[PDB]
Design a protein around this ligand. Structure first.
Ligand SMILES: Nc1nc2c(ncn2[C@H]2C[C@H](O)[C@@H](COP(=O)(O)OP(=O)(O)OP(=O)(O)O)O2)c(=O)[nH]1
Ligand SMILES: Nc1nc2c(ncn2[C@H]2C[C@H](O)[C@@H](COP(=O)(O)OP(=O)(O)OP(=O)(O)O)O2)c(=O)[nH]1
Ligand SMILES: Nc1nc2c(ncn2[C@H]2C[C@H](O)[C@@H](COP(=O)(O)OP(=O)(O)OP(=O)(O)O)O2)c(=O)[nH]1
Ligand SMILES: Nc1nc2c(ncn2[C@H]2C[C@H](O)[C@@H](COP(=O)(O)OP(=O)(O)OP(=O)(O)O)O2)c(=O)[nH]1
Ligand SMILES: [Mn+2]
Ligand SMILES: [Mn+2]
Ligand SMILES: [Zn+2]
Ligand SMILES: [Zn+2]
Lengths: 561, 561
């Protein structure tokens, strides 16, 4: 919250950490950050301490083998419910040793073997107690245990604070599983999500859910998991998640044999092979984000009221170099740092390899294993400032610099569509301090996310997907597209048509709908917006404590007041 | 640990908090703390933030009714396993909003109703599936669910870090329960503890276990839970805990109709009644500890090499006043503080009453509800310095000051036998900086705990209990007695004789034995101590990673290196 104790403690460390960063980070990089030329993310954590950002947790390797967690040498779980109980504790622990999001990829496949152990236990109990209908007891009890295991997970993640006093920022993916255990997990996740959280069944912010969609798996009428696709459509319409990823487009962009889950919100690894040619996903991470204020490049290239193309080329080149220096500055902090810093990450399997206590952690990140993020924002406002559409062109050129950086250093730089929940305002506020109200750019008080078409443009779902799709193939380090839609709870067919179009043309996709609930009557209709707050169409209730109203106005779900 | 991330963050807040305390706390109090005249505990937390110390969590009230926990409006659990899963999350949350220990009192009684719901569910499943042996299916499955629920608890508490990067400091009491559900919980706790933690079955530091012992319940051959007493003796001999409390002596000292569990290690409330005359235990807390260096009073009253009684009376009176000023200083910090600071504690039931967000938290503590702790230490070294035994006499006089303080302020001051894990060295080191090596006092490098007879005195178990017993009736705010014993795993009868003697004469009691395990062979015999480390009698292994060696050399269990 803010005045809550663990948050206050965290703010104290955050302040000490900003001060230490002022002594570690070269002046020109700091100055560029204060002025809003760039944005060095997570300065209240790094480089004062050698934290990394987000990751794909290697849960499979952890669970299969042993691993130490806290003071406890955990063994392979022998039931599904214990497996997600351990998954929940790893969630809290990983969140406390990085400043970014934690992702568990393909939990349907990974947790499958523990649903199998639960099933065998009940089969053993059907013989032990002379149960007449044996195959129906084992299945029915297993269905219940799995439902309960993922209710446990969803609640644990919403009832525990990490180091920083907040609920852990975690995402869960699924959808490539077709075996009966893998189907059951997916239905359990989606059904718990539909039921909602707590007494009143509210819409949770976390975990993020993302489902993979593929032809031959869950995309068309005839596919095996097509019933699960319909469950997911109902869930999306009541609770926003799950977002979907097109397995086909995802693998083309990443170069991966299997769909690549996003770390945190939408950071994507590209394909990487270990020393024996195996494709590795789980365990890999991102080292940080620096974000380039693209509108500011253009604003600073104005001479009078007129754009100067030559000036723009000079500052662009100069600012790209600058961003490399900022990104490299923090990676340099990681030199000499030992694996004692975060045993759960480095010693015990979360990052997929066991380092010894006295090993340097940075060697793990080298030669393309970890990604590193050059963010950007405000293509819409860039296009207005330069007078034409240069989005695909400037982003393609940014990739060309990134390739050079990758080859000079060994670190795998990628272009990242910064989620920028509040950075949209920060950059605009600082650009306003210099240039004032500029028509169509700073006047509204925010910059538009990445390559997204303006939220104030009159466009259909289908035409927005088309305009945005090309960018998923360019900003390979991170991207998503949203479409705004009304209540779709009694129009699952229209929603599905937008999913299918999205899955055909782009990588990662979500749909922003209104998800409201009046507690006193029970209406799940969209509330109408007053100047005071929200109001119930059918009853007329206006108390915030007697309703749940969730939008995704930017990146995360939240209540808009 | 130390270089582990959440710990480093916590150290940053701890440093900022010490600095803020330097601006909040009057100079004379700070100076007295630097010099080791007194010790203001937890200065790295309070008064920079308005934390409190330890508590008895009102789990019963929380579970029975609703309560919000994190973002989730939790409902009454409908199974035992969910109940301890919620108990585990409350543990982590309470630990993060106070700087002291969390206690769940009488978990056998409190969690009983959820064992009853689990039993009814399996009875319902015996009819649903035509199970031949119905009463034996429900009982056998319930036994398993309870075992699993308390394995879940013991592991959750050892696999989660609170705000401060440490495993939560938590204690669990039981033993007054005689119903079949309450027996089953006690056996589950004790059996999990016996099995140990993890792959290798190591001895856990936490949770602390304390069992109540009473005539007519579990003390003599004919008592109903006498079998549980034997389970507890076996557990104590393999894992140190459980400590025991004499229900009879405990109620006489506290004035309570039911046995009073210790908050954290050994802070005891005295009896208190709400506005309608009900005796309240659960929800109540302690506001902090200031500890009086008793040897230093005597050392500072030496004129040449000779004790001056008159000087001792003057500094004693002056230092008691000083301690009141230090204790009151931090309680003053709590004025104006609102319940938004810690919703789990103040709004949602942990402290047993629901305050509104805009309510002041200090009113909850007034008029005897919360205790406040005047610690002391080193009676043994005090007796040497003054030339005679003045322990019962000086402590009785300290109570007389405390009664005056209580009547002037409304806050319930009590005399507290400071556990002083490392304060035993701190005080001795600072007293040495002034007076050097003093025979029998500072020469060994530590002061003896509270009223405990010297750890270097040749005395039997029974004679140590007798010497120490009177002090449990005087230092009512906190006390314990230890006895040192050899391996007692194949002598449960000798151990029981010491428990019975203890239960007759004193309040709260534990037995320090050696609990070692060699992993390579499996010996549970006492390891022999070398200058290098520990060594296995029968095999000869010396690697610390291939063994588990636990002592209680002071207060907590730990590995001595
Ligand atoms: N002007 C303005 N700045 C804000 C607001 N909320 C947060 N900021 C600032 C503080 C942060 O350094 C920066 C970005 O915050 P975000 O919410 O986008 O992400 P986050 O809090 O994780 O910060 P970070 O990306 O790690 O720097 O913007 C706001 O309402 N207005
Ligand atoms: N913290 C936490 N809360 C849970 C867990 N499982 C359920 N809850 C929450 C949600 C409910 O508000 C409350 C009561 O839940 P239940 O005992 O009814 O759990 P469940 O639905 O799995 O069993 P049920 O089908 O109702 O018999 O506790 C868990 O593993 N951890
Ligand atoms: N001389 C000396 N002082 C120590 C050692 N370890 C800790 N201290 C200091 C720092 C603490 O302010 C003080 C008491 O520490 P304790 O381990 O008894 O308890 P705790 O860490 O909870 O500190 P506190 O009671 O809150 O001040 O003694 C040591 O090995 N030697
Ligand atoms: N974090 C956590 N660990 C648990 C829990 N229950 C058991 N564990 C740990 C201890 C073991 O090292 C490992 C595997 O435990 P199990 O799946 O065998 O649990 P349990 O003994 O209740 O079932 P079982 O009798 O073996 O079929 O996980 C829990 O609720 N939370
Ligand atoms: Mn097991
Ligand atoms: Mn339920
Ligand atoms: Zn309504
Ligand atoms: Zn051995």
């Amino acid at each position: 919250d803010s005045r809550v104790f663990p948050t206050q403690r965290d703010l104290m460390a955050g302040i000490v950490s900003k001060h230490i960063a002022k002594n570690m980070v070269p002046s020109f990089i700091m100055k560029a950050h204060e002025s809003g030329i760039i944005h060095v993310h997570d300065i209240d954590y790094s480089p004062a301490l050698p934290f990394t950002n987000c990751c794909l947790v290697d849960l499979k390797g952890m669970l299969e083998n042993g691993f130490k967690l806290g003071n406890a040498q955990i063994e392979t779980p022998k039931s599904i419910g214990v497996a997600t109980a351990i998954m929940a504790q790893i969630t809290a622990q990983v969140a406390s040793h990085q400043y970014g999001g934690t992702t568990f990829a393909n939990v349907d496949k990974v947790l499958s073997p523990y649903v199998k152990r639960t099933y065998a236990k009940h089969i053993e109990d059907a013989e032990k107690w002379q149960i007449a209908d044996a195959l129906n007891y084992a299945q029915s009890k297993t269905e219940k245990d799995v439902y309960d295991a993922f209710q446990a997970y969803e609640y644990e993640v919403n009832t525990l604070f990490s180091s920083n006093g907040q609920t852990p920022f975690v995402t869960i993916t699924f959808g490539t599983g077709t075996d009966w255990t893998e189907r059951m997990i997916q239905k359990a996740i989606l059904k718990n999500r539909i039921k909602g959280l707590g007494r009143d069944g509210i819409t949770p912010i976390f975990p993020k859910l993302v489902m993979f969609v593929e032809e031959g798996v869950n995309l068309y009428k005839d596919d095996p998991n097509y019933d699960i696709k319909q469950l997911a459509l109902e869930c999306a319409s009541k609770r926003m998640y799950p977002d979907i990823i097109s397995a086909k487009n995802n693998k083309a962009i990443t170069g991966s044999s299997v769909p690549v889950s996003p770390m945190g919100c939408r950071s994507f690894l590209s394909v990487w092979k270990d020393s024996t040619g195996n494709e590795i996903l789980d365990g890999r991470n991102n080292l940080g984000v620096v974000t380039l204020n693209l509108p500011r490049i253009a604003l600073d290239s104005y001479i009078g009221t007129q754009f100067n193309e030559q000036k723009f080329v000079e500052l662009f080149n100069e600012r790209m170099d600058l961003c490399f220096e900022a990104l490299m500055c923090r990676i340099s902090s990681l030199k000499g740092v030992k694996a004692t810093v975060a045993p759960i990450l480095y010693q015990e399997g979360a990052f997929g390899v066991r380092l010894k206590p006295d090993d340097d952690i940075i060697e793990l990140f080298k030669n393309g294993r970890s990604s590193v993020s050059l963010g950007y924002i405000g293509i819409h406002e860039l296009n207005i400032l330069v007078g034409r559409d240069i989005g695909r062109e400037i982003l393609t050129k940014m990739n060309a610099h990134l390739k050079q950086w990758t080859e000079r250093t060994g670190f795998a730089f990628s272009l990242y569509s910064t989620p920028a929940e509040n950075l949209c305002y920060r950059f605009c506020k600082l650009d306003t301090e210099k240039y004032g109200s500029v028509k169509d750019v700073t006047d509204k008080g925010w910059y538009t996310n990445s390559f997204h078409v303006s939220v104030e443009e009159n466009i259909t779902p289908f035409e927005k997907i088309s305009r945005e799709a090309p960018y998923h193939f360019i900003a390979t380090g991170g991207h998503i597209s949203y479409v705004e839609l009304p209540d779709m709870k009694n129009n699952l067919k229209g929603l599905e048509a937008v999913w299918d179009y999205a899955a055909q043309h782009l990588d990662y996709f979500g749909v922003n709908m209104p998800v409201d609930k009046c507690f006193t009557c029970g209406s799940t209709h969209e509330m109408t917006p007053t100047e005071n707050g929200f109001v119930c169409s059918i009853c007329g209730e206006t108390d915030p404590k007697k309703m749940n109203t969730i939008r995704r106005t930017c990146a995360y779900l939240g209540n808009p007041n």
